[PDB]
Design a protein around this ligand. Structure first.
Ligand SMILES: CCCCCCCCCCCCCCCCCC(=O)OC[C@H](COP(=O)(O)O)OC(=O)CCCCCCCCCCCCCCCCC
Ligand SMILES: CCCCCCCCCCCCCCCCCC(=O)OC[C@H](COP(=O)(O)O)OC(=O)CCCCCCCCCCCCCCCCC
Ligand SMILES: [Fe+3]
Ligand SMILES: [Fe+3]
Ligand SMILES: [Mg+2]
Ligand SMILES: [Mg+2]
Ligand SMILES: [Mg+2]
Ligand SMILES: [Mg+2]
Lengths: 246, 246
């Protein structure tokens, strides 16, 4: 008997039953539903399907219960063991990459600039593929760790990310279809900031004006996480000042 | 956009989010939860897990919305293509089988005895295993089709079933563990009655006094589905009169 598992899991069970009754779900519908979720399970989409309708709500929760630079949903594509960089992120030399630059400061919720903070960054190849997770792509690519200096400053040069769709061929995709939504997410860059003394801050940031920023199939775009459009020497720039609490 | 999928699926999504907020589920809990359900998916327990907390409620629904001999949850172990029998069900000759006898009538909700109704029956080997689904067991065993005669009567001789537990080694088992329930179901026999003119009636029936009839881990035992204890010549007897609607 786990007090909390039994509080939260129970609350859900009790709550879904109600719907099963009120909406008057038939024997034949119930099968159709269960048959669906086994496909979802079969398709290894179990976590995905959850992430879409839920994870975004769970951020809205944490953002209420804490003081930090705006949080965002984490996403499936984070891999630990990213290489530390001065630096520049390792990216492919190819024509279709556009330079992106990321500057800023990591600091405490009490205001003190933190040094030796590790900023873990990952983002999509121009195709929408993440490294080491897609199509024979090296893991040291499009991933890296940034470490704030004596002033709590970090700067990194990298290629631009792109919007990508969650897998659209499966049960989740269509299910969104029936729900009048789509499979597309706006382009974003992934940050996880952890200082050995503080609570981890995981977030992603989008680009003002980018496609899908209005309609994110997951709901996890929020005004703060939209960066203004600023170029320097024809190089898109993100200036992000993180605040981790603790 | 499927009007109903979007009504019922939506209602659930909206309803689970509330819990995620109210109970104040953390980022770290959410993972733990999602991590759980992928195990459930990994363990091919996706349907099971649902059947336990839900399917029993879905009967309570149908039993409200229709006129029939009491319905019951279907269960995973029904296989179509059961052999028609006069008859007797094919069972193993072994010592530990106790004779069980099943008599009765199938009839319409308007009262007319139906003839040529097909009563599909399946039940557990003395071990708790179902045929063709367990341990190299022939499918013509512990399964059969009964066909009501000119009077709408059916009778079949068969071996006794036994209580069995839903798979207890996996994520569902323990999850019930945390919820203060168990893995055990009381002994029951499975009937599906379909006449080519009428709505299928699927139900199972338990034995008065049998273990677990009070505590069914799934909730799907109900007073009607408890048969009284009656022996004839030292042979347990079930007298069941089905009423299919339409
Ligand atoms: C194992 C849990 C996985 C995570 C669950 C997702 C978490 C939150 C989002 C889940 C969305 C709700 C799942 C409902 C899926 C319905 C599929 C469907 O309707 O197929 C359309 C279905 C067939 O089309 P399909 O989408 O290709 O399968 O439409 C039909 O023809 C039948 C009518 C469907 C109406 C059924 C209404 C919902 C009944 C489901 C009962 C079981 C719900 C248990 C889920 C509890 C969630 C905690
Ligand atoms: C894909 C859908 C499959 C069908 C879903 C089942 C349908 C109705 C029954 C579902 C029961 C609810 C599932 C919750 C499972 C919780 C697992 C757990 O707490 O592990 C204990 C977990 C670890 O132990 P474990 O059980 O071995 O994993 O306990 C912990 O240490 C962490 C605290 C757990 C508290 C989390 C509260 C629930 C958060 C889940 C958020 C996602 C819910 C989405 C489900 C929507 C359903 C429609
Ligand atoms: Fe991403
Ligand atoms: Fe059964
Ligand atoms: Mg600076
Ligand atoms: Mg600045
Ligand atoms: Mg008779
Ligand atoms: Mg009689």
């Amino acid at each position: 008997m786990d007090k909390r598992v039994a509080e939260v899991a129970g609350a859900i069970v009790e709550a879904v039953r109600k719907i099963l009754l009120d909406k008057r779900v038939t024997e034949a519908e119930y099968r159709a539903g269960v048959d669906y979720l086994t496909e979802v399970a079969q398709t290894r989409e179990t976590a995905l399907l959850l992430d879409v309708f839920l994870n975004s709500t769970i951020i809205e929760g944490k953002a209420q219960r804490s003081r930090t630079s705006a949080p965002a949903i984490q996403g499936p594509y984070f891999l630990e063991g990213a290489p530390v960089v001065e630096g520049v992120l390792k990216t492919y030399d190819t024509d279709d990459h556009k330079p992106l630059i990321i500057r800023g400061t990591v600091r405490s919720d009490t205001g003190e600039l933190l040094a030796g903070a590790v900023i873990d960054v990952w983002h999509s190849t121009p195709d929408g593929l993440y490294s080491g997770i897609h199509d024979n792509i090296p893991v040291d690519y499009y991933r890296g760790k940034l470490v704030t200096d004596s002033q709590g400053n970090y700067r990194v040069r990298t290629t631009m990310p792109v919007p990508y769709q969650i897998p659209y061929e499966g049960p989740t995709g269509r299910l969104l279809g029936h729900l009048g939504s789509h499979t597309w997410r706006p382009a974003h860059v992934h940050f996880k900031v952890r200082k050995d003394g503080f609570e981890p801050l995981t977030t992603q940031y989008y680009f003002e004006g980018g496609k899908w920023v209005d309609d994110d199939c997951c709901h996890g775009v929020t005004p703060d996480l939209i960066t203004p459009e600023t170029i320097e020497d024809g190089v898109r720039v993100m200036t992000l000042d993180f605040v981790i609490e603790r």
